[PDB]
Amino acid sequence: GDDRELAILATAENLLEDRPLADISVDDLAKGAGISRPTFYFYFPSKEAVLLTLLDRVVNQADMALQTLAENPADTDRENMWRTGINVFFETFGSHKAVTRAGQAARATSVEVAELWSTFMQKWIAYTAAVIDAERDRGAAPRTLPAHELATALNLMNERTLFASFAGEQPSVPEARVLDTLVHIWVTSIYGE
Amino acid sequence: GDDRELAILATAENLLEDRPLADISVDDLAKGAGISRPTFYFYFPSKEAVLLTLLDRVVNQADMALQTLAENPADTDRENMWRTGINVFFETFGSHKAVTRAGQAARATSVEVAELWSTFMQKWIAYTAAVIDAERDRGAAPRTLPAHELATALNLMNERTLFASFAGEQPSVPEARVLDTLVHIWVTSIYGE
Numbered sequence: 124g125d126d127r128e129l130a131i132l133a134t135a136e137n138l139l140e141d142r143p144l145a146d147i148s149v150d151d152l153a154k155g156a157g158i159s160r161p162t163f164y165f166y167f168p169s170k171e172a173v174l175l176t177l178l179d180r181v182v183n184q185a186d187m188a189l190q191t192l193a194e195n196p197a198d199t200d201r202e203n204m205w206r207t208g209i210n211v212f213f214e215t216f217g218s219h220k221a222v223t224r225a226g227q228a229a230r231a232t233s234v235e236v237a238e239l240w241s242t243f244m245q246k247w248i249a250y251t252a253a254v255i256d257a258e259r260d261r262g263a264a265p266r267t268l269p270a271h272e273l274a275t276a277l278n279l280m281n282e283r284t285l286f287a288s289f290a291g292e293q294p295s296v297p298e299a300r301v302l303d304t305l306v307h308i309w310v311t312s313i314y315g316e
Numbered sequence: 317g318d319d320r321e322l323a324i325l326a327t328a329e330n331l332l333e334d335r336p337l338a339d340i341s342v343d344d345l346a347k348g349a350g351i352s353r354p355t356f357y358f359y360f361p362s363k364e365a366v367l368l369t370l371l372d373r374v375v376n377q378a379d380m381a382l383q384t385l386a387e388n389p390a391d392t393d394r395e396n397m398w399r400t401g402i403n404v405f406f407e408t409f410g411s412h413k414a415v416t417r418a419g420q421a422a423r424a425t426s427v428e429v430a431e432l433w434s435t436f437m438q439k440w441i442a443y444t445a446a447v448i449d450a451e452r453d454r455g456a457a458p459r460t461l462p463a464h465e466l467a468t469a470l471n472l473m474n475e476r477t478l479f480a481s482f483a484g485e486q487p488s489v490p491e492a493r494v495l496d497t498l499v500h501i502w503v504t505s506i507y508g509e
């Protein structure tokens with residue numbers, strides 16, 4: 124039942140390793156999931172809906188892990204706290220690079236994909252701003268830029284910079300260096316005067 | 317002669333204000349430039365080649381202005397020097413938002429567009445790294461991250477953050493706030509310990 128649906132999802136993520144979504148057919152997903160093309164359409168209206176589902180699970184996985192961190196503050200310094208949070212996105216999306224890559228491409232053509240990314244980026248930025256505000260209230264960070272504007276730029280930096288690393292774009296920061304790179308920029312811009 | 321070519325270019329940039337490149341036809345460019353469809357093909361092989369030319373001029377305009385700044389150091393403080401340089405990209409691309417928007421979309425489908433962006437981003441990052449290195453040599457900046465890796469992340473931040481502002485994406489930094497936002501993050505991460 125839902126086992127056929129997981130098969131479609133797994134086939135799509137596996138196939139997106141080798142070719143873009145345009146080079147994947149609904150017949151390709153059916154064959155890989157051991158079903159017919161009509162049966163596929165019972166589970167998903169299109170191949171784009173398959174990718175939307177895959178991206179939704181990856182994004183919610185990252186959101187939920189961030190939630191877990193929030194409820195369980197790690198006993199460590201401020202730089203490592205920021206590192207642990209940025210690392211949620213590094214590990215979650217870096218463990219699903221094919222879905223991440225195809226998800227960013229689909230933003231240009233899928234209203235749902237664009238709304239999904241926008242909704243969660245708005246959420247993660249608001250949470251970033253609230254932490255920055257808490258730190259300022261504590262006297263731990265100076266009151267420089269508006270916290271929400273600072274948080275917006277730092278989150279967009281991570282989105283673009285992580286994506287470039289995962290895809291091996293030129294230019295990009297090497298994937299083994301990108302976490303330390305982003306943490307440095309977050310910590311200096313949040314706490315610096 | 318070249319006056320027909322400028323007409324095609326102007327028509328394309330004007331039309332890209334209202335619709336994506338997919339909704340612009342070669343007939344649309346011909347009509348707007350006062351020529352026939354066969355005559356258009358004498359000047360450009362495709363509508364994508366028209367956008368490539370438009371993006372090439374905008375990118376070279378920004379590159380040349382940055383060159384001008386380099387040769388003519390502004391007598392001012394370090395923060396304003398960085399501001400003046402980031403402002404090249406703010407003003408150049410912000411004065412050609414339609415071409416900027418369509419140019420970023422075409423990266424996903426045009427090898428030439430992708431190579432063009434990559435070549436100039438590599439150039440601007442190397443120049444950023446060389447300035448960071450000079451400042452460290454002078455004792456004006458601490459030796460924290462590898463300069464080229466830091467420069468890579470800060471340039472990708474500006475690319476993504478400026479684009480989001482120009483397009484009015486949600487989320488984005490308001491366009492009237494984005495210059496101060498990026499300068500703060502550049503200056504704190506370059507000079508901060």
Ligand SMILES: CC(=O)Nc1ccc2c(c1)CCCC2=O
Pocket residue numbers: 204205206207208209210212247248250251254278279281282
């Ligand atoms: C895209 C991205 O990396 N976002 C991000 C990273 C880290 C953190 C937050 C958001 C919320 C505040 C706490 C935190 O550590």
Ligand SMILES: CC(=O)Nc1ccc2c(c1)CCCC2=O
Pocket residue numbers: 397398399400401402403405440441443444447471472474475
């Ligand atoms: C995308 C972008 O904003 N790049 C950028 C901005 C500013 C500067 C440089 C590159 C080169 C070093 C000098 C400088 O001021």
